[PDB]
Amino acid sequence: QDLTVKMTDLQTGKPVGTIELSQNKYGVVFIPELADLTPGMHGFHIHQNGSCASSEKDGKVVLGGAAGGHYDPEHTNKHGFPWTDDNHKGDLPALFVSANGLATNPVLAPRLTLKELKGHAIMIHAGGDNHSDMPKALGGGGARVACGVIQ
Amino acid sequence: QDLTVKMTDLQTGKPVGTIELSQNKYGVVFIPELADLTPGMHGFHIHQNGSCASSEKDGKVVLGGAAGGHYDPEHTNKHGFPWTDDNHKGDLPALFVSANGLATNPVLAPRLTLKELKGHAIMIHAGGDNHSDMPKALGGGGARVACGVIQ
Ligand SMILES: [Cu+2]
Ligand SMILES: [Cu+2]
Ligand SMILES: [Zn+2]
Ligand SMILES: [Zn+2]
């Protein structure tokens, strides 16, 4: 009842490590083993489609655009906190990256279940996550930089 | 090009003063002359319907419920700041009430026009306004306490 997700750099195409998924009494824990990322905090969310391929938007290329928007099984249409109910179900706590480009700090998402995650995609963004649609939509994550399909 | 709005206490039914509306180069200015309110900051917004009568919700009475929800001519379905574009058009800066129950501090709403306000309703809430739907919907304003129809 724990899954391994391989993460890939959307820009370089090379592997970036993995994230272990575990179920617990208080929700789902995400334990990262990543490297080759930019120090700081990164928006981190479960996206809708089981894909990390690109998509297209207004004549331009959208890296990782195939995974669609944030996981939102209740159709809230809003972006928020991991412990608030009226916003995407796939909104997770932000992912911290060390000075050396490494990510190893685990996070908890109390509202999710391991079972429902299968076939979805995990995304890491360039930007941070303010857990609001203001002043920048979707918490200011911006571009997608790393992706992996939950098998 | 300036209108007077008479405000009424939803709980007592008695007049509470008025708010003057003026148009300027930077938006609409609301200048209050009120009294008989509770000290602090109060959620303040333009609501949809030209009414301050009650409505009904799940067997219970909703004071001022007839004015409907926040003015939202772009159908955003989100609550926010007065200077952010993707949320209700009728979201205004919060109204401060002095220790003596008086409200006299003017506020600016840059996104609105005096012309479009006619037939709408101005609402004062019990609660404050955090300019988010989290952690409480509609900024935590809660109950409606004072209302007036823009004529
Ligand atoms: Cu995302
Ligand atoms: Cu209101
Ligand atoms: Zn989201
Ligand atoms: Zn609003």
Curated annotation (Swiss-Prot), chains A, B:
Any single Gene Ontology cellular-component annotation: periplasmic space
Main subcellular localisation: periplasm
InterPro entries noted in UniProt: SOD-like_Cu/Zn_dom_sf, SOD_Cu/Zn_/chaperone, SOD_Cu/Zn_BS, SOD_Cu_Zn_dom
Protein residues bound to Zn(2+): 70, 79, 88, 91
Residues annotated for Cu cation binding in this entry: 45, 47, 70, 125
Pfam family, one: Sod_Cu
Leading EC class: oxidoreductase
Disulfide bonds: 52-147
Molecular-function GO term, any one: copper ion binding
CDD domains: Cu-Zn_Superoxide_Dismutase
Keyword list, A-Z: Antioxidant, Copper, Disulfide bond, Metal-binding, Oxidoreductase, Periplasm, Signal, Zinc
UniProt cofactor(s): Cu cation; Zn(2+)
Location(s), subcellular: Periplasm
Subunit structure: Homodimer.
Known role: Destroys radicals which are normally produced within the cells and which are toxic to biological systems.
Similarity comment: family membership: Belongs to the Cu-Zn superoxide dismutase family.
PANTHER family associated with the record: SUPEROXIDE DISMUTASE CU-ZN -RELATED
Name of the protein described by the UniProt record: Superoxide dismutase [Cu-Zn]
